[PDB]
């Protein structure tokens, strides 16, 4: 039998593990060890130092990440967003439009 | 400077929404979100002017 009890203290024996296959070329929300985000992950050619865990460019945006299993570096890029514009000749000459 | 202003507490617990959502319950996690929204609106308006 155990003791179910709670007490406020910094954790020393604690750590999660879920594991999931690594999917590339499809943008998705991702959660590496601690670091979360959303984007598409592709193979890289950047070289990290053995102790470095993730890259970061100017303006402090996560650019590349090393996976804990294979210790390979992957580029993160956001998947596409933008605006849509409607081109019309006026609803006094015609009713057909184009979309950009 | 507009992009760099995006990683700031503005008095909240953190500068990232995901951690605020994960570590707090909806009833009282809204105050931090409100502080972040206020700061980001202020910075964007200054940029536009």
């Amino acid at each position: 039998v155990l003791s179910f009890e709670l007490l406020h203290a910094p954790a020393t024996v604690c750590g999660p593990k879920k594991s999931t296959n690594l999917v590339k070329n499809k943008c998705v929300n991702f959660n590496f060890n601690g670091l979360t985000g959303t984007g598409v992950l592709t193979e890289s050619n950047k070289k990290f130092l053995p102790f470095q865990q993730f890259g970061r460019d100017i303006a402090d945006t996560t650019d590349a990440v090393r996976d804990p299993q294979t210790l390979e570096i992957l580029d993160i890029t956001p998947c596409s967003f933008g605006g849509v514009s409607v081109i019309t000749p006026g609803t006094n000459t015609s009713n057909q439009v184009a979309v950009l | 400077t507009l992009v760099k202003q995006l990683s700031s507490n503005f008095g909240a617990i953190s500068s990232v929404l995901n951690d605020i959502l994960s570590r707090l319950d909806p009833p009282e996690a809204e105050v931090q979100i409100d502080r972040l929204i206020t700061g980001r609106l202020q910075s964007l308006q200054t940029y536009v002017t």
Binding site: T77, G83 | V3, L6
Partner: peptide, 27 residues
Amino acid sequence: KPSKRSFIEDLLFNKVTLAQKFNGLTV
């Protein structure tokens, strides 16, 4: 010559030194 610029226009265009994708920002 590539494009149809002149000598001085080419000098001017090579003299001025210049951008990326962001989160919500477009050009």
